Design a protein around this ligand. Structure first.
Ligand SMILES: Clc1ccccc1CSc1nnc(-c2cccs2)n1Cc1ccccc1
Ligand SMILES: [Cl-]
Ligand SMILES: [Cl-]
Ligand SMILES: [Cl-]
Ligand SMILES: [Cl-]
Ligand SMILES: [Cl-]
Ligand SMILES: [Mg+2]
Lengths: 557, 402
């Protein structure tokens, strides 16, 4: 049928007129196929013959069908699509299984001939005109235009979905305790009614659907659970990802490793503890897809542990709105975090991992807080509320860090849970200068052209050193100067720099970095008992800063 | 009846994604929009509308209110509300002893919106877990939060306020967005009584059946401690702090003070306070107390606000148009980092509206995502300033302590 539903008004992009692409001459067999196909469509109202006066045209092709003797028509809507108005997006996101309420029953109904069952704005059909060419282009071809939504036209997915929503509107209104998920040309229908009253509501829905042009399968032809959808496997009381097999390979190409990482990332939303860090490192660099990459031992250890995790099937449970959501996070090391979300202990709705880094230098307390933020946003999308958190960090550790740190934060309700490794601050910078601790005035400078520099220090105890550096920038030499001070000082030490840059990094109490130096600096700071770090304006003729300035400026400034 | 509105050519309308909302805020929006639709103020729309602006729920105290985020549409409409139909901002408002803010947003829903413009006011109520299509609407009347609405309602407003202004020629009334700002030099009881009167006038047209003291707004100077004894550290701290001011205030001097540091001294060492030092020291205090010589508001330039977390529930802020040429600095005090930041932003936005008739773009010391999820939990205002997210330079924080 063609749905009696009002059409959606459609316009071409302003300043633009419809397409006028020239029809290429086809073979007779393709011309015959096309004529047969269009005749059938013409009979059912899908298309209509038009006169020669329509200026517009779009190429039509025909190709063989799945290796059979069936033919299929193929319109090239590239040019119309380029000229058609933009539409609102079909879906803003897709359900996650974990957010689906526990329910008695779900029926899937697909729509037959979806696009062709919906009318096209009449004032727009003229722009969809195509021409079936006569044999070797002797005579005027046959010309049609669409009355329904074309396959491959830009507007079809959106107008189809919105037609279905209008049609569904009253049925959903009258059936509040029935829920319907629309996906493409499928319809998932769920309820807490018992079988009979459910199979009865499905027929009422089918009938309503039919009164409106949409045919659907009957109980005999309705697909049954498990539902396979967007990579998931959906059962009445549980859900998992679709089956994942990790190939046996003597040797891995870039392409095999990419696919492996893809499947592993996908499994990680319900298989806890999946890691891809070491497999990802392998992918670094521009290499051919066909290129073989030997596995490092760390990547090899990683593949094994993932293989162990995936060996036995795991499933997730559905959502009960009357119970709380609990989210637990554990540190997995090397900036890797893993989480689980459940309502009844250890029956997970879903799992996830977080292994992002924000900035070049960071600490476990920042990272944990970013993981909580990520999980909060996800929960709001999936469930419409934030979970209760269980975190591997002491309340005192967390308030010590964030009351002192210069950026604002806030994570919702959490409780400490003792699931090592615990996150802790590894050193603390002193708040006041230390009495009876040597004071190093450090500095570093690099010649912009030479690309070589110096790093050194002067001491209030008269001590001093300078070192020469290759390939260095002004930024690096200032970190290097601070590193010297820590290497050559005792357990307590005051350090005076004039590098805001260096001050910033250290001030933030990083426990991990991208920079080799910063990690050396970090290891030092941990070994110390007290460190006080202070900043002075350069070139203001200050204190000891002036001395170490010139000592290091020479050669050259 | 309908004032035709153009976008700034050749800009297209707003296409901003809807941020995720909790269940209760979604439910609240459904109730509100269901009623407004019955009342003809908005209409459901089809996919042929490609536009979107975000919508949120807030409390203003027990009731939920709809807040549409028109920052993008506003930027794209700026020829209309600022240039073609601009509303003058009185310099007298900041002078008054008392300024009361009144929400007059309900006025707009009584005027129809140009039919060729309505499509740009599209918004979307999302659904939990994406299980149902967003509910899509556009506006049929002047929407709250669009800068065009007060521009268009402008002439109706002056009609409404005419008798009251005439009877009270020393009261200043300024409309900004959904709000009326009403200032006077009356004693507080007389002022409050004059507000009730104004409400009665408004009530014959539209309003149901918040109080500033701008002339008490004074700069939060860069503080130079008065100290018992000074260490090398204290001096260095001080030079770095003065050396920073010297980039802002004409006349700042440090020379007769770094002379104290000369040599390579221990941080803890005590030091004798010179006369030359304690002289300019005090003279700089003079400079820091005053407004910045040479700095003026440029109506063509955007306002920027920077905010620093000081701890103890304290927050420092500066407003400027060109960096380090401060038009205004201040502080805000007194739980929750995000809630406090949210309060400070609204307060700074408010003073900014009173003083300049313009809103600051904020540089916010917080993670984008943290702010994004939490801010509406506390936001009470009916406008939304522009913001971006920065990591505060730790030194800047130090220089604005108390
Ligand atoms: Cl509960 C159930 C019962 C029998 C068979 C599978 C399931 C799980 S699949 C499911 N659970 N709820 C739903 C619905 C939610 C809203 C309307 S139906 N579904 C179907 C569904 C399939 C694919 C994506 C999202 C939901
Ligand atoms: Cl492949
Ligand atoms: Cl349009
Ligand atoms: Cl009072
Ligand atoms: Cl005040
Ligand atoms: Cl000025
Ligand atoms: Mg499908």
């Amino acid at each position: 049928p063609i749905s009696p539903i009002e059409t959606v008004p459609v316009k071409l992009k302003p300043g633009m007129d419809g397409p006028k692409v020239k029809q290429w001459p086809l073979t007779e067999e393709k011309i015959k196929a096309l004529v047969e196909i269009c005749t059938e469509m013409e009979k059912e109202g899908k298309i209509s013959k038009i006169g020669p006066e329509n200026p517009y045209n779009t190429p039509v092709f025909a190709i063989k069908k799945k290796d059979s003797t069936k033919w299929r028509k193929l319109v090239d809507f590239r040019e119309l699509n380029k000229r058609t108005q933009d539409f609102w997006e079909v879906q803003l996101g897709i359900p996650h299984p974990a957010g689906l309420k526990k329910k008695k029953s779900v029926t899937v109904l697909d729509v037959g001939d979806a696009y062709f069952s919906v009318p096209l704005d009449e004032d727009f059909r003229k722009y969809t005109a195509f021409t079936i060419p006569s044999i070797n282009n002797e005579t005027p071809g046959i010309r049609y235009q669409y009355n329904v939504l074309p396959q491959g036209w830009k507007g079809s997915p959106a107008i189809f979905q919105s037609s279905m929503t209008k049609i569904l509107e009253p049925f959903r209104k009258q059936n509040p305790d029935i829920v319907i998920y629309q996906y493409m040309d499928d319809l998932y229908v769920g309820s807490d009614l018992e079988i009979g009253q459910h199979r009865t509501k499905i027929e009422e829905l089918r009938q309503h659907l039919l009164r409106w042009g949409l045919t659907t399968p009957d109980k005999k032809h309705q697909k049954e659970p498990p539902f396979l959808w967007m990579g998931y496997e959906l059962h009445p009381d549980k859900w998992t990802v679709q089956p994942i097999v990790l190939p046996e390979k003597d040797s891995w190409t870039v392409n095999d490793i990419q696919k492996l990482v893809g499947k592993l990332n996908w499994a990680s939303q319900i298989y806890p503890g999946i890691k891809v860090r070491q497999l990802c490192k392998l992918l670094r660099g521009t290499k051919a897809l066909t290129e073989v990459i030997p596995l490092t031992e760390e990547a090899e250890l990683e593949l094994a542990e993932n293989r162990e995790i995936l060996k036995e099937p795991v499933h997730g449970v559905y959502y009960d709105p009357s119970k709380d959501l609990i989210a637990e996070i554990q540190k997995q090391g090397q900036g890797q975090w893993t989480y689980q979300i459940y309502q009844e202990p250890f029956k997970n709705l879903k799992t996830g991992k977080y292994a992002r880094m924000r900035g070049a230098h960071t600490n476990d307390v920042k990272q944990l807080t970013e993981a909580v933020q990520k999980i909060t946003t996800e929960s709001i999308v999936i469930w419409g509320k934030t979970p209760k958190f269980k975190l591997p960090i002491q309340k005192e550790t967390w308030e010590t860090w964030w009351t002192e740190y210069w950026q604002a934060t806030w994570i919702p309700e959490w409780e400490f849970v003792n699931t090592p490794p615990l996150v802790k601050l590894w050193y603390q910078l002193e708040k006041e200068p230390i009495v009876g601790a040597e004071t190093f005035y450090v500095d570093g400078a690099a010649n912009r052209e030479t690309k070589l520099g110096k790093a050194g220090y002067v001491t209030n105890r008269g001590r001093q050193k300078v070192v020469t550096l290759t390939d260095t920038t002004n930024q690096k030499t200032e970190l290097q100067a601070i590193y010297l001070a820590l290497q050559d000082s005792g357990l307590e030490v005051n350090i005076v720099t004039d590098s805001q840059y260096a001050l910033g990094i250290i001030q933030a109490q990083p426990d991990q970095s991208e920079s080799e130096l910063v990690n050396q600096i970090i290891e030092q700071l941990i070994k110390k008992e007290k460190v006080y770090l202070a900043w002075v304006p350069a070139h203001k003729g200050i204190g000891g800063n002036e001395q170490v300035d010139k000592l290091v400026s020479a050669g050259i400034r | 009846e309908t004032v035709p509105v153009k976008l700034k050519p050749g800009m297209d309308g707003p296409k901003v994604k809807q941020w995720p909302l909790t269940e209760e805020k979604i439910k609240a929006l459904v109730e509100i929009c269901t009623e407004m639709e019955k009342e003809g103020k908005i209409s459901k729309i089809g996919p042929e509308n490609p536009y979107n602006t975000p919508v949120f729920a807030i409390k203003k105290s027990t009731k939920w209110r709809k807040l549409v985020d028109f920052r993008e549409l506003n930027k794209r409409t700026q020829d209309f509300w600022e240039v073609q139909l601009g509303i003058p901002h009185p310099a007298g408002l900041k002078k008054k002893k008392s300024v009361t803010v009144l929400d007059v947003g309900d006025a707009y829903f009584s005027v129809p919106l140009d039919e060729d413009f309505r499509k740009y006011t599209a918004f979307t109520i999302p659904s939990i877990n994406n299980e149902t299509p967003g509910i899509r609407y556009q506006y049929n009347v002047l929407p709250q939060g669009w800068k065009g609405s007060p521009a268009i309602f402008q002439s109706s407003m002056t009609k409404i306020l005419e008798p009251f202004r005439k009877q009270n020629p020393d009261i200043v009334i300024y409309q900004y967005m959904d709000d009326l700002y009403v200032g006077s030099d009356l004693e507080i009881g007389q002022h409050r009584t004059k507000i009730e009167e104004l409400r009665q006038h408004l009530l014959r047209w539209g309003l149901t059946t918040y109080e500033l003291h701008p002339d008490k707004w004074t700069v939060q100077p860069i503080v130079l401690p008065e100290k018992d004894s000074w260490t090398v550290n204290d001096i260095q701290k001080l030079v770095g702090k003065l050396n920073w001011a010297s980039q802002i205030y004409p006349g700042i001097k440090v020379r007769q003070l770094c002379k104290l540091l000369r040599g390579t001294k221990a941080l803890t060492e005590v030091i004798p306070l010179t006369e030359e030092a304690e002289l300019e020291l005090a003279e700089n205090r003079e400079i820091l107390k005053e407004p910045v010589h040479g700095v003026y508001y440029d109506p063509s330039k955007d306002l920027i606000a920077e905010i620093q977390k000081q701890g103890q529930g304290q927050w420092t802020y500066q407003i400027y148009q060109e960096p380090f040429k401060n038009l205004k600095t201040g502080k805000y005090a007194r739980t929750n980092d995000v809630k406090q930041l949210t309060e400070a932003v609204q307060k700074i936005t408010t003073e900014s509206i009173v003083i300049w008739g313009k809103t600051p773009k904020f540089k916010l010391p917080i993670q984008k995502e943290t702010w994004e999820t939490w801010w509406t939990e506390y936001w009470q205002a009916t406008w939304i300033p522009e913001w971006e997210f920065v990591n505060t330079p730790p030194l800047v924080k130090l220089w604005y302590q108390l």
